[PDB]
Amino acid sequence: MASSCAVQVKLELGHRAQVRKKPTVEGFTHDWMVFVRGPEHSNIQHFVEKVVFHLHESFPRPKRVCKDPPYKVEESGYAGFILPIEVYFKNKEEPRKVRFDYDLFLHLEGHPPVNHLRCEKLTFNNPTEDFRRKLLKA
Template identity: 65%
Template sequence: MSFQSQNIQVTIEFGHHATFRKKPSAEGYTHDWTVFVRGPEGSKIQHYVEKVVFQLHESFSKPKRVVKDPPYQVSESGYAGFNLPIVIYFRSKEKPKKLSFDYDLFLHADQCTNHVHYEQLTFTNPNEEFRQKLLKACGVSTFVNVCTA
């Protein structure tokens, strides 16, 4: 016996860019940086993303940053890189309602940094409402035959 399962795949970009300051700030900051979550080639992930939470290092004022509208990004200044947990919340009533990622916000001494990481997400048999949201954001639909014993 077999049945068809529908998968919807979307791609998300995580990344950051950092510029090196010619002269450190009074606080000793050597870089200005922006960390982001976005869709590739301008795809509108806000159709299926409710919000993105960036958990900055505890040394920052208000380290938990919640971004509910695009662009999903945070800009700050600093002098060192750190591990930055990112949680993406979906516009879905079904699980998964969120996904967590650990992002390495690294800085290069004396130079600028541009880094992008692509993550492909697969949602299996999403409900019709969420399926439409994924497809609006350039999601790709595939069908898979599933065999049962």
């Protein structure tokens, strides 16, 4: 052109994984909770339409959809797995979403609980003006 806006927003992906006192009856051993949020209390709700957590097939309604904060899933299980997360934007132009393969891993009974944090930076090249102010309100 030559001119370009490069808007960068920050995301936090993380999960807690605790061992239950007594297992559930269904037999599950652990309690975990997985989330997506902005760092340092950023309201990502401004540019995030919805967050989609894709659980394992073993779960009922494995597709969990949060379209209002907090964007998180709470469950109970026996094993860890790769959990595809999809974050949809208040976009109108590509990319409409971003996908992460989140490792929801669990620790053993004699080991301390999991409190994992993962950082992701998003870069939008030449976004629209309306989507920009949304991104910058975060």
